[PDB]
Amino acid sequence: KTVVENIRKKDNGEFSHHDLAPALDTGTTEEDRLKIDVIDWLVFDPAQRAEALKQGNAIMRKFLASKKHEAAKEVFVKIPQDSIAEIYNQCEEQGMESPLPAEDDNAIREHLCIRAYLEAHETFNEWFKHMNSVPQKPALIPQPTFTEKVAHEHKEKKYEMDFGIWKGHLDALTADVKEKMYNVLLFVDGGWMVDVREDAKEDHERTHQMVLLRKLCLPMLCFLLHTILHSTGQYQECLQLADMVSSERHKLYLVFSKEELRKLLQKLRESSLMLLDQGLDPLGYEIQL
Amino acid sequence: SNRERYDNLEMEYLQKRSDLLSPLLSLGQYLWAASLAEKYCDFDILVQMCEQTDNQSRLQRYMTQFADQNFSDFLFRWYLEKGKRGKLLSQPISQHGQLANFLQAHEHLSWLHEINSQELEKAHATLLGLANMETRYFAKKKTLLGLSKLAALASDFSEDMLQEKIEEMAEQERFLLHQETLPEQLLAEKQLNLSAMPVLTAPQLIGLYICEENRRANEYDFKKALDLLEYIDEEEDININDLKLEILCKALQRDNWSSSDGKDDPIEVSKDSIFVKILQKLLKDGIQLSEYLPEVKDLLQADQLGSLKSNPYFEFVLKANYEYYVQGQI
Numbered sequence: 254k255t256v257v258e259n260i261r262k263k264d265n266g267e268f269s270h271h272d273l274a275p276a277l278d279t280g281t282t283e284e285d286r287l288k289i290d291v292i293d294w295l296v297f298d299p300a301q302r303a304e305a306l307k308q309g310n311a312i313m314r315k316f317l318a319s320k321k322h323e324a325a326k327e328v329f330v331k332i333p334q335d336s337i338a339e340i341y342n343q344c345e346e347q348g349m350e351s352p353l354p355a356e357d358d359n360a361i362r363e364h365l366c367i368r369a370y371l372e373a374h375e376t377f378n379e380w381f382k383h384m385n386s387v388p389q390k391p392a393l394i395p396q397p398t399f400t401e402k403v404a405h406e407h408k409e410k411k412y413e414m415d416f417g418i419w420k421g422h423l424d425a426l427t428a429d430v431k432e433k434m435y436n437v438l439l440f441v442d443g444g445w446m447v448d449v450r451e452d453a454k455e456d457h458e459r460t461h462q463m464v465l466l467r468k469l470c471l472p473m474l475c476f477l478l479h480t481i482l483h484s485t486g487q488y489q490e491c492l493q494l495a496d497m498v499s500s501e502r503h504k505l506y507l508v509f510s511k512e513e514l515r516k517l518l519q520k521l522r523e524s525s526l527m528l529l530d531q532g533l534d535p536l537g538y539e540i541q542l
Numbered sequence: 543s544n545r546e547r548y549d550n551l552e553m554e555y556l557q558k559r560s561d562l563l564s565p566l567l568s569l570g571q572y573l574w575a576a577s578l579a580e581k582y583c584d585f586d587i588l589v590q591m592c593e594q595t596d597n598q599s600r601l602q603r604y605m606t607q608f609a610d611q612n613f614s615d616f617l618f619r620w621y622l623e624k625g626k627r628g629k630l631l632s633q634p635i636s637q638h639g640q641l642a643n644f645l646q647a648h649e650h651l652s653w654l655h656e657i658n659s660q661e662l663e664k665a666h667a668t669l670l671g672l673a674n675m676e677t678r679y680f681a682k683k684k685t686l687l688g689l690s691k692l693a694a695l696a697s698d699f700s701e702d703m704l705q706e707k708i709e710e711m712a713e714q715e716r717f718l719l720h721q722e723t724l725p726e727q728l729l730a731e732k733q734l735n736l737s738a739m740p741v742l743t744a745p746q747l748i749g750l751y752i753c754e755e756n757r758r759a760n761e762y763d764f765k766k767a768l769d770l771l772e773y774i775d776e777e778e779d780i781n782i783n784d785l786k787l788e789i790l791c792k793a794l795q796r797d798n799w800s801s802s803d804g805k806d807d808p809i810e811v812s813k814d815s816i817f818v819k820i821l822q823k824l825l826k827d828g829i830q831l832s833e834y835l836p837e838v839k840d841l842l843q844a845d846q847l848g849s850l851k852s853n854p855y856f857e858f859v860l861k862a863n864y865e866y867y868v869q870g871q872i
Contacts, residue, residue: 296844396694492685493685494683495685495688495689495692496685496715498689498692499688499691499692499695501712501715506695511695512694514692514695514696515696515839517692518657518692518693518696521689522654522658525654526628526631529627529628530626530627530628535651535654536682536686537651538682
């Protein structure tokens, strides 16, 4: 724990708010690997899985805030997939309670928040790889011969198939990424990167990082989900994001900037204009007459 | 001083100007229809010639050349009475001080120009007015409040006025939460859809929650059905006390007041009843049962109870629980 916590503490880096900036290509460096290749010290012995998950969450909180999603996924793979069940095995044998203690119930809940965010990122990564693969429509040759017209029919009648297959995969990926982004934006009771055990110990590095990650990640996922829905023509669901963001169950309006609530009202209006020029009301209902 | 001759000669002129120029327009002679319509101010044939050529630059020239003649106010009617909606809102800022004065007759579209002007303080109130007027679709009233509240959370209101309008809207969210939380079986058995049903008044929400089809109705739905009595105006022809009686009678008709195996205390056995669980809620939530409840005489003179109005075990156990829970507050 001291090896891992000293390596967690080597960053004399306060969470500045200018570094919202579009840094590019910020991949896993040697100073990130010396924090991926530190979780092993709590994974060699099963009696440390709870601490491996608590400190693994702390290093994932740093990498996710640093936009190093792959370095956070490298730490998520340093945590073995049995560990949530092993943290219950270590409770029922020996004069403990029904869940493992209040630091660790909150830590399992936090690791489940981090997994749901990695699901909501990788399904977006594959949706985005696929969306950019779009079959190019066969260009019309000027004044073409009979042979070149048959050699345009036998291109367009392949584009009809390729684009039909490509959209048949796009609408499926658009359902999966939409499950994952709703699982994070509507995450259960307390919500994403919030605790439940008020009987837990204070870590103010953890609590600050979680309140920060709710403000980096949840607005960003709403801007991604609006863009997924809008670029696929799902324009009324793009508007239901307003009632989700204002919802008193999840209070997502407390984690946006005022300028980003204004950016969201600007993007909501993009879908509202596409519904209007489709022949629907500003909210996507029928223009009855 | 000769106005009765004038306005009839002006209508004779306006009709014959349209009769003579509309063939030049419909034969596609958009240079010749417009050389006369620019000389004689035929704003229909000028605007028609623009949409029939998508010539938004000649249209914006007319909105600058006939500004002294209200051509933009004419054009905003021309985009309404038959229309395409995006082209009305996507106009230059130099005509927004005219578009807003046309949209003062079109509240259902004015908020889209208020937001496009960044007058978010108006857009809040316009969307709240439209939410109050939206009785026809529950999901549209919710979306109008959701957009109104997101305008108030983006306008430079002072912290006091912002807390006023947050709370005024939070009570309309609390009211609509009673319609949002209708059981999925009650909705399915009545074949209702939250996305397409109207907004319901408090007596109508009460009437749904307490009905026979709520074959899961409990101490939460029979708490909502009492709390909905606090959302009724003094001009409905409805005795709130007879609703309060009928709610409590229908709670008592969900509870099984049949006799046990003769070994068992009726103040212990009553603690699983939904009637006792709503009394325990009213007590926990701070209410005086000595003032809030109907008389045990006249809850027994209400006819709704039907079969229970002949049951002396119900007669005893109702009285024993009223005695226990009201003399428990003195």
